[PDB]
Amino acid sequence: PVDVAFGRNYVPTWAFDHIKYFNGGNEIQLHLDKYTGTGFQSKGSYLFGHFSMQMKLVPGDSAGTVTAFYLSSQNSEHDEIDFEFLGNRTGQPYILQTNVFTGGKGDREQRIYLWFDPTKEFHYYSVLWNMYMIVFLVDDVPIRVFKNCKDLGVKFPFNQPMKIYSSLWNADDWATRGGLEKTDWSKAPFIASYRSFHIDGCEASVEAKFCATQGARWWDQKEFQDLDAFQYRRLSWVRQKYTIYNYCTDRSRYPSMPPECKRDRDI
Numbered sequence: 050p051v052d053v054a055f056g057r058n059y060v061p062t063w064a065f066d067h068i069k070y071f072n073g074g075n076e077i078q079l080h081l082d083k084y085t086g087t088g089f090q091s092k093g094s095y096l097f098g099h100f101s102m103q104m105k106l107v108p109g110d111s112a113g114t115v116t117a118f119y120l121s122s123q124n125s126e127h128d129e130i131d132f133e134f135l136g137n138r139t140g141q142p143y144i145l146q147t148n149v150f151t152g153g154k155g156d157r158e159q160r161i162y163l164w165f166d167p168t169k170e171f172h173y174y175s176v177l178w179n180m181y182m183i184v185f186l187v188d189d190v191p192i193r194v195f196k197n198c199k200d201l202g203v204k205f206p207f208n209q210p211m212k213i214y215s216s217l218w219n220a221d222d223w224a225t226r227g228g229l230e231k232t233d234w235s236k237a238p239f240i241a242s243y244r245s246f247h248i249d250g251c252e253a254s255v256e257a258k259f260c261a262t263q264g265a266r267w268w269d270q271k272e273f274q275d276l277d278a279f280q281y282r283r284l285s286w287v288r289q290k291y292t293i294y295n296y297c298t299d300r301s302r303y304p305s306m307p308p309e310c311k312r313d314r315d316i
């Protein structure tokens with residue numbers, strides 16, 4: 050991933066004065082207070098690609114805040130690929146929640162702890178999205194895989210171009226300890242920081258709805274049909290030691306296991 054300026058790829062969409070630009074827009078901060086959070090979105094829409102952001106999360110007390118970095122399409126029956134960082138009281142750990150929506154249906158939450166303090170330094174958070182799979186990455190570690198299993202009747206984000214979004218907002222009702230820890234507004238502003246702003250994708254308008262170089266990009270090559278054995282072992286380590294909630298192994302909500310699990314090694 051190569052670092053460009055914010056304004057090359059992104060525009061603010063709410064509370065313009067709550068986004069602070071540093072070094073020509075090579076670093077930005079989103080601020081949240083009791084009146085408003087803020088958010089931004091990509092200028093373009095994409096069908097497949099590699100999307101990456103360096104982020105450094107809200108330090109100190111971040112209880113009740115959610116910082117989200119996600120791709121979403123725009124019509125009804127929407128597709129969406131989500132990172133949501135759920136903050137905590139001081140000295141208590143963030144959760145990284147992921148989710149995938151297909152045809153308007155989500156409910157595929159997974160939640161992990163991280164193997165570093167996400168407030169102390171910038172780390173990469175990335176999505177690789179091709180016709181074969183979606184991989185969520187934290188730096189070079191795969192934390193989740195969602196495979197294209199249309200052959201088993203399961204939906205996959207396949208023909209709806211998506212924009213990239215990010216935002217910082219309060220979510221008192223559910224973010225921290227299921228909603229027990231409320232935001233301490235005397236500790237505002239809550240500040241999330243961003244760099245890199247990397248977009249390498251198939252540009253495909255909401256109107257035209259397709260990209261001319263499709264099937265021929267570097268992420269369409271055979272090396273990217275699956276993770277290799279080393280990447281799968283990293284993933285299983287995330288699964289075994291860092292995972293606190295997984296919809297795949299949740300048999301109370303999902304009596305009939307999600308067809309994708311065995312392929313994705315979420316089991």
Ligand SMILES: *[C@@H]1O[C@H](CO)[C@@H](O[C@@H]2O[C@H](CO)[C@@H](O[C@@H]3O[C@H](CO)[C@@H](O)[C@H](O)[C@@H]3O)[C@H](O)[C@H]2NC(C)=O)[C@H](O)[C@H]1NC(C)=O
Nearest residue numbers: 134135136137138141142143144224225226227230293294
């Ligand atoms: C914010 O910090 C709190 C701690 O202050 C975190 O809450 C803790 O979450 C862990 C992981 O879910 C819980 O531990 C687990 O409990 C289950 C049984 O309930 C057990 O099977 C596991 O082996 C493990 O012990 C822990 O009980 C819980 N503690 C409290 C006080 O609620 C929380 O995850 C942090 N993150 C957020 C965003 O809330």
